[model samples]
Target chain A: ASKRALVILAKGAEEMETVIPVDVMRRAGIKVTVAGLAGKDPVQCSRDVVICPDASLEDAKKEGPYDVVVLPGGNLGAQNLSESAAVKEILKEQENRKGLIAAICAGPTALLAHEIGFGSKVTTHPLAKDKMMNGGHYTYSENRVEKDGLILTSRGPGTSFEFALAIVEALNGKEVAAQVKAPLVLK
Target chain B: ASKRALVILAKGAEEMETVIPVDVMRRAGIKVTVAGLAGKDPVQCSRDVVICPDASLEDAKKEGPYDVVVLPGGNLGAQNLSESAAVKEILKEQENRKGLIAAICAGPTALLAHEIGFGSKVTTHPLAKDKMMNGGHYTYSENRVEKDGLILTSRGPGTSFEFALAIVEALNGKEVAAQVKAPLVLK
Candidate 1:
């Protein structure tokens, strides 16, 4: 069976951060659902791009136990993710199930909000460093892409390709990741 | 006045190529209209990411004299752009008007189809090189992004950010491009 990914999309999300992973993961042959945080309505991203989600997070939650739960970052979008009790529950369940949890840019700050995966080496956008490093609960790294156990984190839009490819490597093996990367003409 | 861009969206267009340029251009403060070639509908991209275009190409044409006309690439998407007479008129007018025309990956193939911008330096995905170089009309370059006069082309998904930023520099200026690039954390 193919692996599945659930990408939770919140308003004010960075459109590039959100789309790059979704595109690359699909390229890797993963079944991905772009679930909307605010019902199934269109989301107005940080740069004002409008995206229609595949399903609502409330409805998607019932589908249960995705292989990975992805969160994309914009300061406001991450704030929305951090404030959502639904997101908190999703991270808690993913952690309890030992499933992979990947967040990029300000997305990692949501992990802090939910108090999930403390002690893992993580990274966030430099602008978001203070919030992510709060209380010294988790160790910080400057890696473009950081993977510690089941938690994966990446910096910003520039690192998204590396970040998404890392998730593909984690789930589908390096061969598959390399195969997918080639068509992209990545550096 | 804010610079404007028209991005033609067709079914089978590469979503990453489409979204990256649209999102990045908007970040550079360009007033971009994601126009649907098929109509004002949600386009099902090559990897199945559904994107809703802001307006129909038919409608957008009346509103243009845009600063740049952007074409995104997927094999089938390029084929669609090549087949459309509307795209032909758009390219011809953009060329005749001496406005910028930017395409990436197989997207430059559409330029060949519409007989626009002959004898310019261009680049395309390696696999697409033969198709682009088919008659030796345009000089081929291996550059990640190439601009010769009003035509700007780039290789593939990996080169998208560079391509979009090049367009930003062309229309908005270098300072804005650098300012936009810094936050992206590009290498």
Candidate 2:
């Protein structure tokens, strides 16, 4: 069976982090859904790019059993994800099922807010460190990409490719990830 | 007045290449317009990410006198761009005006089809090298981001951030580009 991935889209989302992973994962032959946090409408990303989501989170939530759930970061975007009950529920369910949950930049803060996986080492945009570590619920890593079991985390936009490749490796294995990464011309 | 950029969008365009430059340029305070090559409709990118362009290329051309014109790459997308006489005129006008013109991946092939600039050093995805070097009209480089005078080019998805930062530096200077780069957490 093909691997499926869900990327939650919120207002003010960092378009780079959102698009890079979605594009790279699709390159790895994963079926990825860019689900809107609101209804089936255009999402105004952080730098003003408008992205039309594949489906509403409400609709996508029902269809899931996704191999992975992705969270992208922008300060307000993460805040929106951090505040959503639906997101909290989704993360909890993914954790319970031992599914991969990946977040980048301020994204990990959403994981912290949802109280999903606490013991795993994670990373976020340096500015977001204090927020994700308010109570030291999770250990922090300065690594560009950190994967501690099903919970995978990474830093800001600079690390998005690394983060996405890690998810590809997790879902499709190292061979698939390497094949996918080569074409990107990464330094 | 701040610098302005016109990013041409067509069906099958690489979403990552398109989004990264737009987002990064905006972060550097450049007034950017994601102009749809086909019209004001949403563009379905190579990986199926639907992007809502701010305006049609026709409309944008009327309002232009932009500082830069950006062409993103996907084989089909660049083919679409290469086939458009409108795109040819746009590139010609930008070239005649000595404005910065940037492309990535298969995008430089459009320059070849349009006969925009022949002497600049450029780069493209390795798979696209043959097409771009069809007649050896332009010098080729393997650098992640290659900027020969006003013509800038980059390799592929992994080089997108570097490509975008180079564009930002070209339009807004190094300070703004550096400030913008810091938050992105690039190595």
Candidate 3:
């Protein structure tokens, strides 16, 4: 059996942010399923390319949904994920369910800006933290990786490897995640 | 029939560089085959996670040949790809046969570090030009895209989109590439 993760990719997603997670997770021995956003047959990324989802969002709305849920950040990747009620609903549920949920770079701001933090200490790309903070954000820190409750956050591309490692740790536990990290000589 | 691209994904492969082409080319109706080198069943990206290859390098070598052979650049990714005898053969064929061969960032240096670029105008990531030139490189302003014969190069992750678009245009010609670029408004 394979470990599973659900990564939500949106149109205008940052190519690195989304691809890193999908690639790294699959590399770490986790099976990642691409959950498509509703109404979009294929989603585009920030690098100006469109990718078809492996499955639809409607399928993700079920119970015990996934072991982990991730948001890949970009100009609109995070924003689109945050705006969708389904995304928010999953985040809230992941929090209560102790399932893993995280956003990297600009992705974190979407949750923070939308009041999803709720006392959570999330972070974002260096220059943009204030945007979410001023937008009713309840977060702090500009560190590469920030963990508050079930939420995970990281700075932009500079920290994508660390960002992904953190999520692997959250989902597969520290020991298993460590196995993955050892190979990269990261973390 | 669909145009095809062979993506060599090995350990420490750069996520953005590898995926931008795959996602973007697929959007232009090209089929991407993620192949792993050596006996590694899966190729790991920057993060510790690994992605299983749909086919093995040995299997790929057995195939008659490929239309375009792509190498995505990372410091180690290009090193791993261009250094391999199999890949060297693939690239040499791409050069002589008019099959498209592209490598960005450090990847091009691996191939063109010799006399290949001597006086050819090329483009790549902004910061890499010095190294590119230091290695007997000749190129024009670091544009998003550049083509010197059948070889294509884009700087870094920033130019991943431009690289992908060029591949589309090369494989399917201008009209097809134009349609795919329509939604993104790529200039």
Candidate 4:
């Protein structure tokens, strides 16, 4: 069976961060669901790009046990993720079940908010470093993409492709990831 | 007044290519309008990501004489663009006014179809090179981002950031482009 990914989309999310992974993962043959964190309505990203989600978080949760749960980042988007009890529950469940939880840019701060992945090495957008390190529960790295076991994290929009390829490699294997990467014409 | 950009959003467009430039340009303070080519409705992109355009192309054209016109690429999306009489008219007007016309991936093929910038140096996703060079009307380069006067072109998804940054530098200036580039954490 193909691996399935659930991407939690929120108002003010970084559209590039959200779309890159979804598009790339789908290219790698992973079934990706872009779930709206709020509801099924269109999401206005940080840049004012509006995206229609595949399903609402409430409805998507019923689908359950995704291979990976991806969190994209924008300041307000991450804050919204951080404040969601529903998101906290989903993260907790994914962690408890040992499924991968990946985040990028300000997205990692939401992991911090939910108190997941303590003592794991991670990286966030440079501006988000202070927030992710607020309690210092997790060690930080300056790498473009950092993966410490089930907690996969990356930097900002600049690192989105690498971040997504990392997820593809994790779920679909390195060969599949490389196959997906070539056509992108990345430097 | 801020520079304005018109991005024609067509069905089967590469969502990554479309959103990255839109988001990055907005970050650079460009007033970007995502105009739906098929009318004012949601567009399902190449990878099945749906985007809601800001306005219909007809409506946006009335407000045009924009600083730049951007064309995002996907095989079908570019095909749609290549077939549009409206797009041909828009490109012709932009060219006559000596305004910037940008395209990426399969997007440059539309330029070929419209017979715009016929002698300029350009680039496209490697897979698109043959189609773009079908008649050898334009010189092809492998540069990640290629700009020859008013016509700017780029490669695929991975090069989208560089492509967008190039457009930013063209309209806004190097300093503004650099400032916008920094927070993106691009390597």
Candidate 5:
């Protein structure tokens, strides 16, 4: 069996950023678990959209051992992701074991704020560059994905494809991720 | 009683572009109805968000006339709106009536594609500038809202605040819109 990936679903996550990766990764043959942030009821996304997660964050945390985590960006989503004590603890505990963390758009701001990726290069939405600057040694890249250590980051929503591909690559090697990317023609 | 506005629901609708306007307008006392595109389950949005509508598009059309029609944009939402035949008839019906037609972000692309705003000055998501050159004109201002005839257009997510204000302004006049915009310290 392959490693299971976790996608944190809080209120107001960038729907495309979260879904594209879940989709691309599944298409690339990865197991993705959508974990909700605010208990059981569906979280209303930025635009009145509602998302139902596969499991609760509490349940996932209790079960333990998620291989990868992808944090998506949105004003409300990031706020919720950052403020949630359970989510914060999960990431903190995982890091000691060197978990693979991928944050896209403004999602990385939370990690940046916590000083999680100290002295590491990271990426995020163009508007989020300053947020990342507060936390670590950082550089901007227009390319869809950037990988450093166990962390993967992306520039913006448009780079979601790259972010997912990077995860696929990290999990199953470049050839597997690349094979999926070829037909999609994602550079 | 005033007529209710019908906002279309579809996959990839931008967060603020869709939700903020609805929330603001409704708060301002306008009745807004969220109508789904066809009869799908919870509608997906641009940024990993989803919204389930109060009614299906088919039923909405069957409900006879609505006072206004709104299109919210996410890249995929725009693509879906532009390509949907059901949406075409709605635009056509609105063009023949006195009802208001509003679009935010790439949402207005539906108007251009359906020829509803062929000669009318219009604005949409900044990204549409390249596509609009073949039509009439384009403006780069972050003005939030513009009204040409009964058609209202807005920029992307950043302008959702302006958008709902315009809706309030349209229904309740400048005083109400000002009252609402003032508290938010909107410029």
Candidate 6:
């Protein structure tokens, strides 16, 4: 069966960060659900781009146990994720099940908020480093993309392709990731 | 006054290509209008991601004489652009007025279809080269981002950041482009 990915989309999310992974993962044959963190309404991203979500978080939670849960980042977007009790519950469940959880840019700060990956190595947007390291719950790395076990994390929008490909490699395999990477014309 | 950009959003567009440039340009302080080619409604992209455009092309055109006109590439999206008489008229007007016209991936093929920038150097997604060069009207280059006067072009999804930065440099300046690129954390 194809792997399923749930991407939590929020108001003020980085559109590039959200769309890149969804598109690339779909290209790799993954079933991706872009769930709105708020509700099933059009989301206005950090740059003012509006995206329609596939389903609301309340509804998507019923679909449960996705192969991976993707969290994209923008400052306010991550803050919203950080404040969500629902998001905290989802992350806790994913971790308890030992499922893969991935985040990028400010997205990792949400992991910190939920106290999900202590002592694991991670990276976030440079400006987000201070916030992510506030309590020093996790060790930080400068690698463009960092994966410490199932806690896959990456830098900013610049590292989104690598982040998505890493998710593909983890769920599918390196061969599938390589196949999906070529056509993107990445340097 | 800020420089304005018109990005023609069509069905089957590469959501990554469309959003990256739009987000990055907004970060650079460009007033960008995502105009729907078909009409003012949600457009489904190649990978099934739906995007809501800011306005219809007809409405945006009335406010135009924009600083740059951007064309994002997905095979079918470019095909839609290649067949649009409205697009042809827009390109012709932009060219005659000596404004910048930018396209990426399969997007440059629309330039060929509209006969907009003949004899200028350009580039496209490797898979799109043949279609863009069908009649050999333009010189082809492999540069990740190619700009010859008012005609600017780029490759695929991976090159979108560079493509957008190039557009920023053209309309804003090298300093503004560099400043915008830094926040993106591009390698």
DockQ of predictions, in order shown: 0.78, 0.92, 0.12, 0.95, 0.08, 0.90
Interface RMS deviation of candidate 4: 0.5
Task: Give the per-residue lDDT digits (tens) of candidate 1, residues A1-187.
Answer: 9999999999999988988999999989999999999999888888777888999999899997799999999998999999999999999999999999999999999999999999999999999999999899899999999999999999999999999999999989999999999989887
User: TM-score, each model?
Assistant: 0.97, 0.98, 0.56, 0.99, 0.57, 0.99
| True contacts reproduced, candidate 1 | 0.72
| Cα RMSD (angstroms) for every candidate in the order listed | 1.2, 0.9, 10.1, 0.7, 8.9, 0.8
Flag regions of model 3 displaced more than 4 Å. A185-187, B1-17, B20-70, B73-90, B93-187
Candidate number with greatest lDDT:
4
Which pairs clash in model 3? A24-B49, A26-B50, A27-B49, A27-B50, A28-B49, A28-B50, B122-B139, B124-B155, B125-B155
Q: For candidate 4, give the lDDT of residue B160.
A: 95
| Model 4 segments more than 4 A misplaced | none
> How far off is each candidate at the interface, as Cα RMSD in Å?
1.0, 0.6, 9.7, 0.5, 10.0, 0.6
Worst 10 residues of 2 chain B by lDDT: B114-123
Per-residue accuracy of model 3 over A26-69 as CA lDDT, tens digit each: 76778787777664366656655445565666675663367778
Docking class of 4: high
- Please give, for residues B72-127, the per-residue lDDT of candidate 6 as tens digits: 99999999999999999999999999999999999999999999999999999999
lDDT of 4 by residue, A31-68 (tens): 99999999999999999999999999999999988999
Where does model 6 exceed 4 Å of error? none
Candidate 2 chain A: minimum summed lDDT over ten consecutive residues — where?
Answer: A116-125
Docking class of 5: incorrect
What is the per-residue lDDT of model 5 for residues A78-186, given as tens digits with 9 covering 90 to 100? 8788887777777777687788988888898877655566666776776777767863456555555777898788865556666788888888888998787754422
**After superposition, candidate 2 runs with Cα above 4 Å error:** none
Worst 10 contiguous positions by lDDT, candidate 3 chain B: B45-54
Preferred candidate (TM-score higher): 1 or 5: 1
The chain A TM-scores for the candidates, taken one by one, are 0.99, 0.99, 0.87, 0.99, 0.91, 0.99
